[PDB]
From Swiss-Prot:
Lineage of producing organism: Eukaryota, Metazoa, Chordata, Craniata, Vertebrata
Coiled-coil ranges (or none): 108-130
Induction: Up-regulated in breast, uterus, colon, ovary, and stomach tumors. Induced in breast cancer cells overexpressing NCOA3 or treated with estrogen. Down-regulated in 5-fluorouracil-resistant derivatives of the colon cancer cell line HCT 116.
Gene from which the chain derives: ATAD2
Assembly and interaction partners: Interacts with ESR1 and NCOA3 and these interactions are enhanced by estradiol. Interacts with acetylated lysine residues on histone H1.4, H2A, H2B and H3 (in vitro).
Tissue: Highly expressed in estrogen receptor positive breast tumors and in osteosarcoma tumors.
Stretch of the intact protein here: 981 to 1108 of 1390
Family the entry assigns: Belongs to the AAA ATPase family.
Designated name of the protein: ATPase family AAA domain-containing protein 2
Cited function: May be a transcriptional coactivator of the nuclear receptor ESR1 required to induce the expression of a subset of estradiol target genes, such as CCND1, MYC and E2F1. May play a role in the recruitment or occupancy of CREBBP at some ESR1 target gene promoters. May be required for histone hyperacetylation. Involved in the estrogen-induced cell proliferation and cell cycle progression of breast cancer cells.
Length: 130
């Protein structure tokens, strides 16, 4: 119905806003764009599902997230990809990992403070029924 279309529109507005806030944080600059295959040629061969915040924005806009849980799975994927691709003890790898964890923690903290749980439940139930 139009009431359901309005729910999902509110979801998209909410998710763009959260993603924007992550995207303008200087710690998370590394996560704002897809990894450049010139800059990092073995990335695509190691990491099977690349994800970054620009792509998250494209996915919102393509109506790919029907719940906040589905969004958080992609935020999780940014983080897990960074942990897996950069596993070593050296400071380069530790910096990116720490940033990856801070990205994930921040996304979850914003959603905990700002997402109404009954709004998420509504989205899940509309999604369950389609
Ligand atoms: C996320 N990420 C990595 O996980 C590894 C290298 C790299 C290089 C440029 C930008 C992002 C990058």
């Amino acid at each position: 119905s139009m009431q359901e279309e309005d729910t999902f529109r509110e979801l998209r507005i909410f998710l763009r806003n959260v993603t924007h806030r992550l995207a303008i944080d200087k710690r998370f600059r590394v996560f704002t764009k897809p990894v450049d295959p010139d800059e990092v040629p073995d990335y695509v061969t190691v990491i099977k599902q690349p994800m970054d915040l620009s792509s998250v924005i494209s996915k919102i806009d393509l109506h790919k997230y029907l719940t906040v849980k589905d969004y958080l799975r992609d935020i999780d994927l940014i983080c897990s990809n960074a942990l897996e691709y950069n596993p070593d003890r050296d400071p380069g790898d530790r910096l990116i990992r720490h940033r990856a964890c801070a990205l994930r923690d921040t996304a979850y903290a914003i959603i905990k403070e700002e997402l109404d749980e009954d709004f998420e439940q509504l989205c899940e139930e509309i999604q369950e029924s389609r």
